[PDB]
Amino acid sequence: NAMRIHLTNVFVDDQAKAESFYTGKLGFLVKADVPVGADRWLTVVSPEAPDGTQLLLEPSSHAAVTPFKEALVADGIPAASFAVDDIAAEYERLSALGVRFTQEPTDMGPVVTAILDDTCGNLIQLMQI
Amino acid sequence: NAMRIHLTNVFVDDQAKAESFYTGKLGFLVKADVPVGADRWLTVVSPEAPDGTQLLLEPSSHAAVTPFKEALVADGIPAASFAVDDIAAEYERLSALGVRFTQEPTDMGPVVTAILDDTCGNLIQLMQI
C-alpha cells in the first residue's frame, strides 16, 4: 500500500540525443518509449535493476527549465546522481567512449565522486557505493 | 558494475518541516540524517523498499531553486511522482491526515493520478501502479 520511489527525472534538451547518450554511453536500457503529443514519455532503467526505479528523460520546453539547468551547470551542481561499485573503472570506461568529465574521481570522505556532462544541458554525478 | 538509480531529490524550503511531512504524513522512513555544515543530508525510503532508492530532502537555498519551484507550482506541475497500489485508498488516508490535494484521483488512461501539496513548496504526484 505504501508509496514507492519508482521514478526520477532529468530535463534534457533533445530526447533523441538523450536516448543515444544515456543508453549508448552510460549503459541504461530503454524501459518505456511512448508518444505523447509531439514528445515522448521516455524512461530508462539500470541493467542491474530492470524492474526498479525508472529515469524519465523529459523535455526542457517549459520556460522555467532551461534557466534553472543553466544555473546549476554554472555552479558545477549536478542535476542527478548515480551509484557505481568502481568509479575509477567507470571513469576510465566512459572517458574512453568520449564522455566529458568536469570533475575527475575525487575522494570526498564517505564517498568518492566524479561529475560528467550529459550533452543535454546537465551535469551528472557518479558516486562510489 | 553498471550505474544504479539509487537517489532522487526534492527541494524543500525547511528540512524539519519536510522530515515531519514526508515521514509523518506520507509514510516514508528516515534512512540517513547527517549534518553537513548548517544543513543536513537527509534521505528517506519507502517502507516497502528500505534498501532501495532514497529520496533526498534538500535545502532550497541556491538562488535559482525557489523561482523554479514557484514556476512549477504556478502551472500545476509536480516536482516528483510516487507510485501506489490503490490511489483511492491513499487519497482517503492522506486527506484524513490533513494533506491538501490540488487534484483528486483522476483517470488519465494508462494511469490514475492525484496531486498533493507537500507544504514545502512542491506539488507531488501519486500515480496508480
Side-chain angles (χ1 to χ4, degrees):
Chain A
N1 73 85
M3 65 186 72
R4 301 184 311 275
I5 310 175
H6 75 303
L7 187 71
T8 192
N9 64 302
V10 164
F11 293 105
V12 302
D13 66 337
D14 177 314
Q15 298 181 291
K17 178 169 52 174
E19 184 179 357
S20 170
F21 188 87
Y22 278 73
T23 70
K25 267 85 168 179
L26 299 189
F28 298 104
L29 308 182
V30 171
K31 178 67 161 184
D33 187 359
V34 189
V36 54
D39 307 296
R40 300 141 80 178
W41 176 266
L42 178 60
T43 59
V44 300
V45 288
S46 170
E48 309 273 335
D51 297 347
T53 304
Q54 288 175 39
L55 167 70
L56 178 69
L57 303 175
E58 72 178 294
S60 301
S61 45
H62 186 281
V65 174
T66 293
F68 178 62
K69 293 174 56 182
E70 289 179 340
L72 293 188
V73 167
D75 282 338
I77 299 163
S81 314
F82 304 109
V84 297
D85 295 317
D86 186 345
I87 198 165
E90 191 69 3
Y91 169 72
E92 229 56 71
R93 188 182 75 77
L94 292 170
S95 291
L97 290 175
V99 172
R100 186 187 157 237
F101 284 76
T102 61
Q103 188 211 289
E104 294 181 357
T106 300
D107 211 331
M108 310 281 194
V111 280
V112 183
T113 67
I115 298 176
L116 65 93
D117 176 2
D118 79 350
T119 75
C120 299
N122 311 110
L123 295 174
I124 295 301
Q125 188 184 57
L126 279 12
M127 297 184 43
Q128 184 173 271
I129 292 175
Chain B
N1 73 85
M3 65 186 72
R4 301 184 311 275
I5 310 175
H6 75 303
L7 187 71
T8 192
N9 64 302
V10 164
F11 293 105
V12 302
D13 66 337
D14 177 314
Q15 298 181 291
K17 178 169 52 174
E19 184 179 357
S20 170
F21 188 87
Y22 278 73
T23 70
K25 267 85 168 179
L26 299 189
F28 298 104
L29 308 182
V30 171
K31 178 67 161 184
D33 187 359
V34 189
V36 54
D39 307 296
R40 300 141 80 178
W41 176 266
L42 178 60
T43 59
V44 300
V45 288
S46 170
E48 309 273 335
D51 297 347
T53 304
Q54 288 175 39
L55 167 70
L56 178 69
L57 303 175
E58 72 178 294
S60 301
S61 45
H62 186 281
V65 174
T66 293
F68 178 62
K69 293 174 56 182
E70 289 179 340
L72 293 188
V73 167
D75 282 338
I77 299 163
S81 314
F82 304 109
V84 297
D85 295 317
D86 186 345
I87 198 165
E90 191 69 3
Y91 169 72
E92 229 56 71
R93 188 182 75 77
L94 292 170
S95 291
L97 290 175
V99 172
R100 186 187 157 237
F101 284 76
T102 61
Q103 188 211 289
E104 294 181 357
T106 300
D107 211 331
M108 310 281 194
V111 280
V112 183
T113 67
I115 298 176
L116 65 93
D117 176 2
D118 79 350
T119 75
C120 299
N122 311 110
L123 295 174
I124 295 301
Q125 188 184 57
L126 279 12
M127 297 184 43
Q128 184 173 271
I129 292 175

